[PDB]
Amino acid sequence: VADIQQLEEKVDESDVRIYFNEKSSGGKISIDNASYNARKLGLAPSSIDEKKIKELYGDNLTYEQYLEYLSICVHDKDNVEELIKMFAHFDNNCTGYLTKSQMKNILTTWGDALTDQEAIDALNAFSSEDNIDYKLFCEDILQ
């Protein structure tokens, strides 16, 4: 797992700092605004990451604790195959497609569930067609 030094070769710390200044109150940043900044930096935190940092430092992070959080958000082991296999689990006809409604159920049920409108919006933004090529979808979100 990325340390802060390595994080700072991957992202511009000038951005890291400016995004912190945008959201900080009292010299600290809330987990939710830290996750927002992580995403602006092209990182993808889950609730596992949020809860890990919260367990160490509480709801509001100093600048350095925010840097530690970002290092946890890097996820270098992410690959498209694992994402595809998750969806393919529900593709028992082995068609390569799931409908927007099927995709919605898969995304709003278990895990860090999206809201119905979040899942709907992400799916409509991806494709105007109802059949989603989930391999194409996974390749898109990973970039």
């Binding site: 092209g42 994402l83 898969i106 995304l107 895990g111 860090d112 979100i141």
Partner: peptide, 18 residues
């Protein structure tokens, strides 16, 4: 089932829609 990979999908979706 396959919960950790589900978390990554949802994570990247939230990243994309930020």
């Amino acid at each position: 089932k396959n919960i950790p990979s589900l978390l990554r999908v949802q994570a990247h979706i939230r990243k994309k829609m930020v």
